Each structure stands twice: as C-alpha cells, then as structure tokens.
Amino acid sequence: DWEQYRDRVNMLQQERIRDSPLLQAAKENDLRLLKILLLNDFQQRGAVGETALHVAALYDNLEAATLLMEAAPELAKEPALCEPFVGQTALHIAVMNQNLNLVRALLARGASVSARATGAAFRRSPHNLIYYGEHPLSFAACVGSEEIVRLLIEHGADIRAQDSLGNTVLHILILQPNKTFACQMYNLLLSYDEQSLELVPNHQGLTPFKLAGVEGNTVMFQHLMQKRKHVQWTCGPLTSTLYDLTEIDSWGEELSFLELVVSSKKREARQILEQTPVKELVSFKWKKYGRPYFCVLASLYILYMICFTTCCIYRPLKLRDDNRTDPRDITILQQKLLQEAYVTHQDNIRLVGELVTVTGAVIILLLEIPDIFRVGASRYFGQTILGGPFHVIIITYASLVLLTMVMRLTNMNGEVVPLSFALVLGWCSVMYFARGFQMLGPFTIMIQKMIFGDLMRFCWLMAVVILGFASAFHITFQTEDPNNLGEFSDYPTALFSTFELFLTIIDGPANYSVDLPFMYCITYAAFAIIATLLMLNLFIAMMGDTHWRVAQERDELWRAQVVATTVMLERKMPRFLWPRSGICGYEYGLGDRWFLRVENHH
Amino acid sequence: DWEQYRDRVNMLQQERIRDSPLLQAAKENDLRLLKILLLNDFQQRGAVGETALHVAALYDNLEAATLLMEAAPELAKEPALCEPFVGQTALHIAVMNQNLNLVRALLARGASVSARATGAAFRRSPHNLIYYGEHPLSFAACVGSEEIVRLLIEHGADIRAQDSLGNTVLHILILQPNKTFACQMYNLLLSYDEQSLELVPNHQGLTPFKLAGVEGNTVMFQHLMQKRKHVQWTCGPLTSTLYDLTEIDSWGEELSFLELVVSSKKREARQILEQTPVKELVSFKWKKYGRPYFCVLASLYILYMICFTTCCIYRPLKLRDDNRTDPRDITILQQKLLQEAYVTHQDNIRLVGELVTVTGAVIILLLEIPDIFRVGASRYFGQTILGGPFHVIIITYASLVLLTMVMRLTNMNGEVVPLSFALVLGWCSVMYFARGFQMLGPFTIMIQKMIFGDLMRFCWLMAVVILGFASAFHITFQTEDPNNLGEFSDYPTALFSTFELFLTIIDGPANYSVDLPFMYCITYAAFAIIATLLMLNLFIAMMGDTHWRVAQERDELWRAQVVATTVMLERKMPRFLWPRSGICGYEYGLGDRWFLRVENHH
Ligand SMILES: CCCCC/C=C/C/C=C/CCCCCCCC(=O)O[C@H](COC(=O)CCCCCCCCCCCCCCC)COP(=O)([O-])OCC[N+](C)(C)C
Ligand SMILES: CCCCC/C=C/C/C=C/CCCCCCCC(=O)O[C@H](COC(=O)CCCCCCCCCCCCCCC)COP(=O)([O-])OCC[N+](C)(C)C
Ligand SMILES: CC(C)[C@@H](C)/C=C/[C@@H](C)[C@H]1CC[C@H]2C3=CC=C4C[C@@H](O)CC[C@]4(C)[C@H]3CC[C@]12C
Ligand SMILES: CC(C)[C@@H](C)/C=C/[C@@H](C)[C@H]1CC[C@H]2C3=CC=C4C[C@@H](O)CC[C@]4(C)[C@H]3CC[C@]12C
Ligand SMILES: CC(C)[C@@H](C)/C=C/[C@@H](C)[C@H]1CC[C@H]2C3=CC=C4C[C@@H](O)CC[C@]4(C)[C@H]3CC[C@]12C
Ligand SMILES: CC(C)[C@@H](C)/C=C/[C@@H](C)[C@H]1CC[C@H]2C3=CC=C4C[C@@H](O)CC[C@]4(C)[C@H]3CC[C@]12C
Ligand SMILES: Clc1ccc(CO[C@H](Cn2ccnc2)c2ccc(Cl)cc2Cl)cc1
Ligand SMILES: Clc1ccc(CO[C@H](Cn2ccnc2)c2ccc(Cl)cc2Cl)cc1
C-alpha cells in the first residue's frame, strides 16, 4: 500500500543522508566538516535523487546551503529524480520553509522559478496532507509568503502557469484551509493579472469562481463577489446593491455554477446556496417559477398514480378453470387472456388508462436515462440533494410497468408480482415531491436518514434474534399437532411469525384448550423481554437520540434540495416557461450583463 | 410583482442619473463640471421626478448640494413626483442621511418642514424595510438624531402631524426596532407636548400606549409606565408603588387595551402580559373572579354534555319493520317516528333533556355568532390565544344538534350521522376549559401544536404508504376466496385495513389453515418494516424532538390563554359579577382614577 511505500521512501532517504558524509553535513550544519569535504564530487544524491543542497534546504541550513552553492553553483538548478519527489528543486523546499534569505541566494544562482514538482508527493490526493500544486509561486502563495511571492514574480514566476490538474495559483488558493489569508494572497496575485486569470479553467473546466462554489469555500466566494457587485446608493440605514449574475446564473454554458454546487459531494458546498447574490436568486426562481411548476408536476404525477392504481383495481380476471382439490387452496380467480381481456366497454375504458400507464413509464425512462449519463450513475443514484433513491425507485417502477405490459401481451401468468412492486414503489415515489413543501420536505429527509442509519443497524441485530428464536420456536412445535398452533408449523412460517411477534403485529401464540410445550412459555418469555420490551423500545430511544442530532443537517439538506429542484426544473423544462432571471443590463445601458438588485438594512 | 417594479424603478433612476450630466455631477461631486453646468435648466429631473438636489442629498454631497442651491434656491422646495417617491424632498433625504449641515442649508433656503413623503416607498408594508411615516420630523426621530429633531421643531415641524395611517411621531417611534433609543427620543418629543400627544389616536383608534401593547414593544410599555406610577413610600428593602390603571383597564372604552394585546398577531404582544401594572392586574382578576366563574362554566358545560349524551343513549328506536334478507345485514332496530317517539313517561323525561340540549345549541350560537363579527372571522377562528379551533367545533356541534332537531321533526332517517359527529365534537370541546387549569392547560396546547404540526406532516406521507400498500394487498387477494381472509376483499376495506395495520390497531392477516399468496408475505414484511417499525416509531421520535423545543412557548401561550379567558369573561358576563378592579382614587382624594398598588422587595 502507498503508506508503506512512502514510509520506506522516508526511511531510505534518512539512511542515505546518514551514510553520505556530505548529505550528513548538509543536515547537521557542521561547517568545519562541510568546508573540508567541499575543499577536497558535489553531484552526490540521496535516496530520491535529491542533492546535498536539497538536504541543506530541507533542514533549513542557510550556511550549509550557501557553502554548497559557493562550491558548486549548478546545484541550485537541480531537481530531485525519483517517483515521489520528481522535479522538486532546492527552491521549492526553501519556499515551503519560508527562508527568504535562502530563496534569494538560490534565485541569484539561477534556480528555476518555473520548475514543476511533478512527483506524486505533490499531487492532489487523500494520500497527501497538503496540495500546493507544482510551482515555486504556487508554493509561496499557499504558504502565505507575500514577500516570497513578489520576489518570485519579479524573477519571472509565470502567474498563469498550470499544474497536472490544470489548476492555476488562484485555483490552488481556493483549495487551501486558511480561507482568510488566501484572500489577501488572491488580491496580491490579481495585482499582476493586468483573458483574465479569474477566467482560466482547470482540466475539469472549473474557473476559480466555479471551484470556490464546488469546494464550498464560502469565504473566497463572498470575497470574489465583493468585485462583482456595485453599490447603487445608501440612504440612512438602507443600501441598494446590484450583483452581476454572469458567473452564478451561467447562461447558455454547458454546465452551470448552480448545477456544480448542488451536485458537489463536499458538505461545505451547500453553504454557498446561503450567500447574498445566490440565496436571493434561488429564492426568486423558486417562488416565481419553481414551486408553481413543481405543484403542477406533483399533481399530474399523483393523478397518473391514481390512473395506474385504477388499472390494477379493475385488472382483468375470470373464474378458475379447474377445481380447488387441495383443501388449503383459496385461489378462485385467474387471469383473462389478451384475446378475452378486451371485450366490454369497461375494458376499452381501462385500455386508455393502461396506455396512459405505459406511456408514463416510457416517458419516465426517456426523462431519467439521459440524466444518469450526464450526472454520472453513482452521483445520480447516490446524492440525497439530487434525489438519488427516488431515481432508483422511479426507474424500477417504470421497468416493472413495462415488464407487466410484456407479460400481458405474451399471456404470461403472475402479473400480481410486478404490479405489487409497481404499486408500492410507484406510490412511495410520490415522496419525491415532498421536497417542494416546507411541511413534508425535512421530514422526508428524516425518513431517508432513519432508513439508511438506524433501521439498517436495527435490522442486522433483529435478524439474528429472529433466527435464534424462530428456530427455538419451530423445534419446540415440531413434535406437536399443527392444527392447534399454526404459527411455527414449518421454518418459513416460524421465521415470518417470529418477525411479526418481534414487532407485535400479531398476537403471541396461545390456545388455552390444549397443553402447549413448557419450553414454549420459557422461550416466548425470553423473546418478549429481548425482542418486544428491550429492542423494539430501544429502537424508539435510538431514533429519538438520532433525531435531535440530525435535525440541523436535515433542514440544510432540505433548503439545498429545493435549490436542486429549482436547478433541475430550469434545465429540463421548455425555456419559454423559465424567463431569464434578474435584470437585463442592456435596456439600462450596462451592456450584455444580467444583474440581481438587493436592498438591505444595516 | 412589486419587487420587479421597485427594481426597475431603481434601474431607471440610476440610468437617468448616468444620462443627465447635471445629475451625474450631483452624484460624483466633481465641482469643476458642476460649476460649468450651473454657469452655462436647473429643473432637470431623474426617473421619479427627483431633482439634481435630491441626487446630491442622496449621495450625501454637501458641496454639490450647496452649489445647486446657490445656483437655484427654489430646488430646496421641490418634491419628487412619481408613484414610489411622491412628495419626497431633498430635506427628507438629508435628514435620513443625518447631514445636519445640509439640513440647516436646506431649511435656510425654505425647504418645507411639513412636507409629506406620500409615495409607497414610505408606507408601512411588508415590501418596505423601514417605516418612518411621512414628515422630516418623524424621519429625524426614527433616525435617532436629536440635534436634527430640535432643529426641525424650531423651524416649525408640527409635532402633532399625522401620516396616511394617522400615526403621529410617537406612534412611529413605538414601531422602530431600536426600542432603547426610541425612549430618549420619545421624551425629547414629549418635552414639546405642552389633548396630550400621548392621547392622539391613529386611524385604527390606537393611542401610542395601546400601540406599544399591540406591537409588543415591552421596552416602550415599561418606559410609558414610569410616568403612570407613584412611589408611595420606601422602607428598608420594601417599596410601595401605585400604578394608574386608566390606560390598561380601559373602563367603558369600546375596545380595551387587554383585548387589543391578547388578540394581537405579534408574538411579542404576549410579553406585555408579564409587565408590573398588568401581571398583577390580570393575576388579581383571574384568582378573584376568573377561575371561580370558569370552574362554574366548565361544570355547567360538562353537565350539559352529560345531558346531551343521555339523550343519545336513550334515543328513540323500535324493531325493524322488514326482514334481514341479505345474510350480511346486521340492522335489527330503526328510528321511531315523531308521532310514536313521545308516548311513555321516560320519553317525556327525555324530551326535557332534548329541549335543554337544543336550548344549549341556540345559546351557543347566540353567544358565538356576534363575536365572529367583532374579532373578525379569521382572528376568531385562527388565534390560539382566543380559542380559535374550539370556536369552530362548538359552532359545528350546535349546528349538528339543530340539524338533528330538524331531522327528528321531519321524520328524516339517519340521525346517527349528525349525532356521532355531535358527540365527538361536543365532548372534545370540553378541552376548551383545560385552559383554566395549570395541569391540563399547557398540555392542551401540545395537543394543538402536534395536530397542526407533526400529525399533519405524518398523515401526508402515511397516506401515500397506505395507498401503495393497500393497492398491493388488494391485488394480491383479488384472485383468492374472500371468506378465508376478509381484510383486503375490496378497495375500501383494503384501505381501511391497511390504515389499521399501519397503526397496529388490528392484527396482521393470517390463516394458517390455508395457503395465502407468497406475494402477501413479501408485501406485509416490507409494510411492517416501513409503516410499523420505521414510521410509527419515527412519529414518537419527531414528537419527542418537537416537544422539548416547543415546551417554553407552550407555557407562554398558556399564561396568555388564561389572560384572554379573564378578558373574555369580564367582557361577556354581567357587570354585577365583575366589580371594577383595583383601588378607587375618589374615596382617597386622588380624583376619578383607579389604581393598582404593588409592594416589592429590592
Ligand atoms: C439490513 C438487514 C438484513 C438482514 C438479513 C437477514 C435476514 C433474516 C433471515 C434470513 C432469511 C433466511 C431464510 C431461510 C429460509 C429457510 C427455508 C427452508 O427451506 O427451510 C428448511 C431448510 O432450511 C433450514 O432448515 C434452515 C435454513 C438455514 C438457517 C436459516 C437461514 C440463515 C440465514 C442467515 C443469514 C445471515 C444472517 C447473519 C446475521 C444478520 C426447509 O423447509 P421446512 O422448514 O419446511 O423444513 C422441511 C424439512 N423438515 C420438515 C424436516 C423440517
Ligand atoms: C392531512 C392528511 C391528508 C391525507 C389525505 C389522503 C388520503 C388517504 C387516502 C385517500 C382516500 C382515497 C379513497 C379511495 C376510495 C376508492 C373506492 C372505490 O370506489 O374503489 C374502486 C374504484 O377506485 C379504484 O379502484 C381506485 C381509486 C383511485 C385510487 C385511490 C384513491 C387515490 C386518492 C389520492 C389522494 C391524494 C394523495 C396524495 C398524497 C397524499 C371501486 O370499488 P372496489 O374496490 O369495490 O372495486 C369495484 C370494482 N372491482 C371489483 C373490479 C375492483
Ligand atoms: C415487496 C416490496 C413491496 C418491497 C420490497 C418494497 C419496498 C418499499 C416499501 C421500500 C424500498 C425502499 C424504501 C425507501 C427508500 C428510500 C426512501 C427515501 C426517503 O427519503 C423517503 C422514503 C423512501 C422512499 C423509502 C420508502 C419505502 C421503500 C420504497
Ligand atoms: C428483521 C429484518 C432483517 C427483516 C428484513 C427480516 C425479514 C424476514 C424475517 C422476512 C422478510 C420476508 C419474509 C418471508 C417472505 C415470504 C415468505 C413466503 C411465505 O409463504 C412463507 C414465509 C416467508 C418465507 C417469509 C419468511 C420471513 C421473511 C424472510
Ligand atoms: C367523524 C368524526 C368523529 C371526526 C371527523 C371527528 C374529529 C375529531 C375527533 C377531531 C377533529 C379536530 C380535532 C381537534 C381539533 C383541535 C383541537 C385543539 C387542541 O388544542 C386540542 C385538541 C382538539 C380539540 C382536537 C380534538 C379532536 C378533534 C375535535
Ligand atoms: C393516513 C391519514 C391520511 C388518514 C387521515 C387516512 C385515512 C383513511 C385511510 C381512512 C379515513 C376514513 C376511512 C374510511 C371511511 C369509511 C369507509 C366506509 C367503509 O364501509 C369501508 C371503508 C371506508 C371507505 C374507509 C377507507 C379508509 C379511510 C378513507
Ligand atoms: Cl409524501 C407526499 C408528497 C407530496 C405531497 C403533495 O402534497 C400536496 C398538498 N400538500 C401537503 C402539504 N403541503 C402541500 C398535494 C396533494 C395532492 C395533490 Cl393532487 C397535489 C398536491 Cl401539490 C403529499 C405527500
Ligand atoms: Cl379536557 C378537560 C377539560 C376540563 C376539565 C375540567 O376538570 C375539572 C377538574 N380538574 C382537573 C384538573 N384540574 C381540575 C372538572 C372536572 C369535572 C367537573 Cl364536573 C368540573 C371540573 Cl372544573 C377536565 C378535562
């Protein structure tokens, strides 16, 4: 694994540094020994191809570093050579240690301002504790060393240079955790912008502005917006400001800023939706257009589920064509064949409801399947904010409807099976629309967070209790007459009875007209204590405990689900239903831009 | 919508200011350009009829404003002209910007101290972030600018002037959010009162004192009471104070201060009921008169419900007059007709209970219907503090009793229907009286806050689960013999069974003497996990979470419901039962006033 490899790399590196007297002296700064070694081979390299000057820079030894450079000035030009540290110069190290005196002394000797630390130890990854990109300028920037940043830009640091992710120094500052200084650095770098560096995309296509949204960097987002706003007037406690929406609303771009924020996997990204140009924009879009269209679509879907349900209630059945010879058989009706299922006026009235039913299942797949391939199947089905679990069950619903159509046409028996799944999944998919309503929306997120959290843990331990007790109850009744207590009469019935007895959805077996096994009363007392009293009530206790701790995040997830719904509706619906949002600049002489005006009290 | 209109107004305003070189110079303060333009048409107006001097005042440019006034002194007199800003002078703007030097310079040039900003941007509304009324003095006051307030009063600001709501500067200060400075301003304005300005009503009929109650301004209320109290004595740690009740008790006034506070829709208004002249007054009224009369009325209503119930238990029925030919029919009795329903001594004893029952339903409507028209139907039925939901069900109860009387008299069949509603609603309306008792009162507010909150959200998602599963269970059993498992034998029974199975109020279907469908055991396992375990227990978890967060407001709502009951009883009951409260001043030589004396430890 990578941790064991990095560890060896570090161990071999320290071993070489102890083995070589020149690298050893570069780490210890014993200028006596180092002068004698240099007066007496300067190319000597550690375990990763690093020079004695990289070693002096790593241990921050300016005296050893200047002796090494005075003896062999060419060392200032050298990269490290091996897979972890490829391209790392003594200048990258001196910059990361903030040694301005060593950085000057290296630049005075031709150390490259444009060198790229291409090795893995520099790549963005979960493996690496930092990500400064690849260049001395990007290091000095993320390190928060203006004096080094100016010194490098003077010496030719290309400010528009890009690393292996395509990230410029501006993209890299958006990724750093000192969000507050990163701003002062962001302004220092834009003081040399003179296409703007603000508009350069990385290889994901993200500009710095889109990256601050995607990464949830709310401090850099609100800092970037201070240069995309104009104060129209202030009068007493009131100010009117005009925000340029060109970045946030992303008109006619192939993937918008708000899509990138709502689909981001960072929990910090949802906080961007609470910021001033945005909250007001997504709130305007939702009241004016989003909620009216979502209430119409919710109503049409519920009427379509009533239509589908009615085609199940009036499903085509006839009297069985053979006798119930087994006294335990209760089936009295059978399917009509296709050639007899459409004969009466009521069958033709149903056929309209069935063709509407099938048409809705086709339309569901025509609307769903393309969005799997844009968003990505895992995000499509995994993301709570995008509706992931409802996209699974609506595709499953439409698939079970189309399977039921193929079964009808082919005279295949057993349409009850796909229709029973399609009725449960079809109606529970009406919970998709709960996200538009402040009453139902946050509660539907508790249902989801309780299903995947507490109900899953409960069902795993509930299963071993049911297997223990269903087996004990089955073998207790194995020897007794099945007609006197039917609940445990075979292992599948004993499992199902024990599951219903666990949840108290059926009454505990009892027949006072006969002597039940004494081992049953012992086993059922232990079961009612463990299953019913302790665990079924411990479920309520752990749900009540989960609920107060999740209640803040559920509201944030709901406020984000409303924005994701707003963004979905505007991307999918015909534009004539969704007029461009905000204020057109052109009819007021402001040029091609579109704006949001907000008035605030202070 | 108004937001899009205000936004255009702001955009057209800024466009004109950029288009006109004179308004542009008034905003930028480039005295070079402005001197040349004025030396070279001074009437030029922006998008809302505002002058270049309004523009200089808005951008707070005293140098541009004094050049514009020096070139054309008549500009100081000008209002703005268009619908948002009608009547707004440069003096309104200079006052709101607190520019005392510009305000003098305008007043020195005849700017009107009595101008009214009649435009909508000044009206009280949810659309407007501030409300300063219409006059320069009311602006200077709400802005908290004594030096400008004195300067205006010297120049003739009519302190008794009223805006389009009838609000004086005192009413407007009660509405402002800096409740603490507003007091220092309130005293500054009363220093010029010399009918008192304290007693002038707005167009709602509210004086400043009633408005501080209605708006829940507890800081201004307790400040107003410092001038309506007298300290009789202090001895060591004890003080005795005498509060004038003339304002709070509002004797013989058509609508009292305490009615206006308990019927207010502001959540802050209930906090007035916790203040020193009041809490002691409403507590005295409740112990001495309120609770004794409310316990008598509670007892009389419960005895009337026992009387009505007894007329239902002894309802007049006879043997059916035709055979039960359908083997699934269980009806054996039928109504007696009016001409046979009153024959025995026990029928005449009932008839007294029925005439008492009907008389109580008439009395309920005679007591209820007038109060709908005073309070207003929406407040009458909407307000928790006034008893809103109990006023709905008591009017509904009386209507179902009078309908049942019309049915009896007309020999109409089916009296079971209106009587079953009248028994449920009649007895649940006994919960109205829970508000008098500290044990039952706050709990009856949780019942209400759980019905309209958590039970509503639950019932919406519970309904789609019941529609999904009732349909799956119905079509699973559609083909099987109805006599072996009756629960899902038609769609209305399948809905009702699935509702009872959701809540575990009936046992899960099972008949071990026959092979049930395998799809039933699959569907019922999924149902018991989703309905019974997860959601029925998630109801308890979300109620437990709502309960601790609502528990403070429920106690405040209960303490306010007791005062609303006290105020109701005193307004409705015969005065001889409700002696005037407090201490008559006349028999101690204090004149016509009535007082509350409170003794306090400090
Ligand atoms: C997110 C939570 C997920 C939790 C997942 C857990 C699920 C709960 C239960 C598992 C379903 C097991 C279904 C067994 C059906 C047997 C039918 C049958 O064929 O029975 C028996 C055969 O087998 C048995 O004897 C026993 C089967 C093996 C033991 C039970 C299954 C264990 C499954 C373990 C799963 C992992 C659990 C780990 C901890 C969670 C035959 O039938 P018979 O009884 O008529 O005997 C006919 C013959 N005589 C009359 C002579 C008796
Ligand atoms: C604050 C919370 C408020 C929540 C409100 C929600 C309410 C829960 C349930 C709704 C009541 C529906 C009553 C249906 C009665 C049908 C009787 C009948 O006539 O059935 C059927 C006819 O209809 C049906 O087939 C299906 C009816 C349509 C679907 C069910 C109603 C959907 C209502 C949706 C409401 C909105 C929900 C949105 C999400 C909350 C006939 O009768 P049969 O079965 O004897 O068939 C006789 C004929 N064979 C023998 C051949 C079968
Ligand atoms: C035999 C059939 C009837 C069984 C398998 C059916 C399972 C249904 C009842 C289960 C399967 C997954 C469940 C499920 C998945 C996830 C979510 C998202 C959550 O935010 C709301 C509840 C909701 C929508 C629930 C509802 C109930 C579902 C849809
Ligand atoms: C406790 C958790 C883990 C939940 C999920 C466990 C469910 C188990 C107990 C349930 C789910 C589906 C049930 C089930 C499916 C269908 C049938 C066919 C029926 O003719 C006999 C019972 C039988 C065989 C039962 C046995 C018990 C099962 C397997
Ligand atoms: C068919 C009939 C019997 C059905 C419709 C009757 C409904 C009754 C049970 C329901 C309807 C509204 C409910 C209701 C409304 C509001 C309140 C106010 C609350 O502070 C206490 C409970 C209380 C008083 C409850 C009691 C139960 C009521 C009165
Ligand atoms: C889950 C929430 C939404 C609550 C309110 C839902 C209630 C539903 C399930 C209940 C309320 C009243 C019930 C109801 C009313 C009366 C009858 C007549 C009876 O002869 C057959 C059942 C039938 C038709 C049932 C069906 C199920 C209903 C409609
Ligand atoms: Cl789980 C679930 C999901 C969505 C709805 C949709 O609920 C709304 C009503 N509502 C309830 C609360 N706030 C709004 C609705 C019901 C019926 C029809 Cl036909 C249209 C609409 Cl818009 C109900 C349950
Ligand atoms: Cl929901 C409800 C509402 C009101 C009462 C009234 O309860 C009181 C008794 N009580 C109980 C607690 N504190 C006082 C009562 C009962 C019977 C009779 Cl006849 C008269 C009275 Cl005054 C009881 C339930």
UniProtKB/Swiss-Prot annotation, chains A, B:
Q: How does it sit in the membrane?
A: Multi-pass membrane protein
Q: Which residues lie within the membrane without crossing it?
A: 489-509
Q: Give the reaction(s) catalysed.
A: Ca(2+)(in) = Ca(2+)(out)
What are the glycosylated positions?
Answer: 323
**Tissue expression, per UniProt?**
Detected in kidney cortex, in distal convoluted tubules and cortical collecting ducts (at protein level). Detected in duodenum, jejunum, ileum, kidney and placenta.
Recount the PTM note: Glycosylated.
Q: Outcome of mutating residue 507 to E/N/M, per the record?
A: Attenuates Ca(2+) permeation and Ca(2+)-dependent current decay
Q: Does the keyword Nucleus apply?
A: no
Amino-acid positions noted as binding Ca(2+) in the UniProt annotation, renumbered to this chain: 507
Q: Where are the ANK repeats?
A: 17-44, 48-77, 86-115, 132-161, 165-194, 204-233
Extracellular side stretches: 314-350, 408-413
Activity control summary = Activated by WNK3.
Q: Transmembrane ranges?
A: 293-313, 351-373, 385-407, 414-434, 458-478, 522-542
Region Interaction with S100A10, as annotated, extends over 563-567
Q: Which GO terms describe its biological process?
A: calcium ion homeostasis; calcium ion import across plasma membrane; calcium ion transmembrane transport; calcium ion transport; protein homotetramerization; regulation of urine volume
Q: Which residues form the signal peptide?
A: none
Report one GO cellular component: apical plasma membrane
Question: Which residues lie toward the Cytoplasmic compartment?
Answer: 1-292, 374-384, 435-457
The listed locations are: Cell membrane; Apical cell membrane
One molecular function GO term is: metal ion binding
Protein purpose: Constitutively active calcium selective cation channel thought to be involved in Ca(2+) reabsorption in kidney and intestine. Required for normal Ca(2+) reabsorption in the kidney distal convoluted tubules. The channel is activated by low internal calcium level and the current exhibits an inward rectification. A Ca(2+)-dependent feedback regulation includes fast channel inactivation and slow current decay. Heteromeric assembly with TRPV6 seems to modify channel properties. TRPV5-TRPV6 heteromultimeric concatemers exhibit voltage-dependent gating.
Q: How does it assemble?
A: Homotetramer. Probably forms heterotetramers with TRPV6. Interacts with TRPV6. Interacts with S100A10 and probably with the ANAX2-S100A10 heterotetramer. The interaction with S100A10 is required for the trafficking to the plasma membrane. Interacts with calmodulin. Interacts with BSPRY, which results in its inactivation.
Q: Its family?
A: Belongs to the transient receptor (TC 1.A.4) family. TrpV subfamily. TRPV5 sub-subfamily.
Name recorded for this polypeptide: Transient receptor potential cation channel subfamily V member 5
- Organism in which the protein naturally occurs: Oryctolagus cuniculus (Rabbit)
- In the complete protein, the residues contained here run 28 to 637 of 730
